[PDB]
Amino acid sequence: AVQKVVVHPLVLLSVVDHFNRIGKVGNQKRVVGVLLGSWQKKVLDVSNSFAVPFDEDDKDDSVWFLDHDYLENMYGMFKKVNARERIVGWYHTGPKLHKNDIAINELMKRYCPNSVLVIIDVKPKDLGLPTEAYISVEEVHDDGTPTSKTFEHVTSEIGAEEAEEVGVEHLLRDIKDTTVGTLSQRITNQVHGLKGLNSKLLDIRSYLEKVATGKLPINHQIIYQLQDVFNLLPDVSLQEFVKAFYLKTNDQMVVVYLASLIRSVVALHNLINNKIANRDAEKKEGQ
């Protein structure tokens, strides 16, 4: 199992590039490639990738051709180029998982005993990362239903080598805004977090709408998880949590006040120095 996975800007760029290549060549709506990386302790760093010729139908959910001969040729060649980048999984640029994903994961597992799929949604997004990482795992159902292979999510994030960071920063030299300030950036992070929480709640609400109306069968694991969450929701009017909140709010506002006073004194010192310099310069000019 892999709890954490780090994808790289080179991987993202190559995935976008492969999607564009296939779009220009024909019309598939999805592209699949192989993903090479390292195995830092319980952390999968996927450093590179290469496209492989993949095709599938839209109806049977079983008619799909993946060229593992091309896969192994390209992998051995990339091994000749660089050795540390071993097969670590595969990627497919679908907006969402597919039925074939389990079979393709088995085909990859024929190569990597612990293969991690990463859906790299090439379509631009706003409230989430572009990579969704999954790992196949057997689901031993408690209700006696037969055990079946299923995809399990693993926390995925984007990280860069030193050179990758240098390159991406050069590319974003004029777009990325760095004159924001730490406080402004953190407030932006807070509002983005609120937006993400709202998006997750809206997804759950839509699923509940579908289930209640009847499109989706009752999923007992999901219902268990939902009621566990709703029970985990805290109470902020207990008359003891309120006292603790006020006590810590004051314990923080005292420090904020001290810092503000110190900043005010420093600003007054700067003003005194500036006015002293101004008078000295003016008097010397008048001399």
Add this chain to the structure above:
Amino acid sequence: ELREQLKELTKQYEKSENDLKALQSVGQI
């Protein structure tokens, strides 16, 4: 005679190729 002739020439070929590979290497401090 061509057998032995080319065999010795191939041995000298291997030696000369090794020499050139060495020649294409620089020292380190």
Add this chain to the structure above:
Amino acid sequence: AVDTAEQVYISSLALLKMLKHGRAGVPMEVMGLMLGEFVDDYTVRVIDVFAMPQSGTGVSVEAVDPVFQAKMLDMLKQTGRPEMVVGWYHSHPGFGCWLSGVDINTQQSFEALSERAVAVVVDPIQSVKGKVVIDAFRLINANMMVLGHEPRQTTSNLGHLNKPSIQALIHGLNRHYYSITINYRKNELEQKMLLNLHKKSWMEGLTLQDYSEHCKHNESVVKEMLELAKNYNKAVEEEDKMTPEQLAIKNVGKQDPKRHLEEHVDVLMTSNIVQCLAAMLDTVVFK
């Protein structure tokens, strides 16, 4: 004749690949082939690049492997790019952006097959987040430079690249080879993922810092603020008293109470304000 307006447009994927190969093989002058197309007489897109095996020592270019090159090209055509080789790139880790004798010989070899082949030199060591040191080159003809000709045609005023560096000038620029201006392709779609880099999930956006750790941090920082306040009182006293050396030689090697106090107030105020806002937003949203 060639024009002093030729422009090599290196794509984002190409730049990232060269930088990765650079800060993967150091100090070895690692090398690869640049795939693109000579769209016209003044422009050279470099859509992609791919590394070469780099067999054994690589302090010098390594006589591009024809079989590896051919198998790369065939598989790329199979899985996308039907593009020819527009040049070769290699790394100069900290040297600069010039060409050595072996580089010049290899670029002769490339021109012999394709007169328009370009030679890109990256500098992964000297690159920094916002400016990547990279330069495109083609060789001046000994024949013309002895028979009194300028091997570039000055139709435009685009020969103002950077006032070429002294390193390149002494290593053989403007005599045996010339620099070709380099630009980059902006798609606004890859840039979205490059921005998604550094992004934090809403978990991190809404998480509250460990309150015990926060209180300990505030206590400590206020302690250093107290000591720096003592030292600031001392410094302001003996500041106007004498200013023969106060200008520059009264803070070197000695702590600056005003500067460190400003830093402490900034950091602690940021932390406290951010945590207060996070706590309040959490108290409401998770009700």
Add this chain to the structure above:
Amino acid sequence: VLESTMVCVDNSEYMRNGDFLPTRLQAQQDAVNIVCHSKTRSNPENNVGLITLANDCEVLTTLTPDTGRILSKLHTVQPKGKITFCTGIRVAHLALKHRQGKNHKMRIIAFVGSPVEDNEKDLVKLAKRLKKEKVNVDIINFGEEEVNTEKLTAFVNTLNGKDGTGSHLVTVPPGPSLADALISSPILAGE
């Protein structure tokens, strides 16, 4: 002639049958050996791949000029499950489409001696799709000379249309190894 071909091989539970000496599995191995040898003796740029038709409907080796790989992969095969053959042909056609040599003429040859329980409507639909996408198929049948031979003949005729001669069928009743018929068949005769 530049030919990109794949051999679909049915390896169902019935391929432990001994009507062809010694067993249908060995007969099929010999048949693929000789057909791939013919492909190699043809334009060497011709390339051959292998698909196995079973409960998994898998692809063993993709397009490759070499033959030892295909022979070893087919040797490392056992008979299990039933045949689908609709998946089979569709996956084969996808492999055709995703071939490095576009100029190569598309070719599928299917050893399908088995009961094909697929409705003739979908058979003819797939035949029409294949022919309109310009892939010819040379089906080989053995064992069941009656259960599916009518369906295969109809499938080949539907591919044929009026002049689509590329589509062919060859049904061989039980006997010795499936070698003499494949050698003296119109398919390899036209090679």
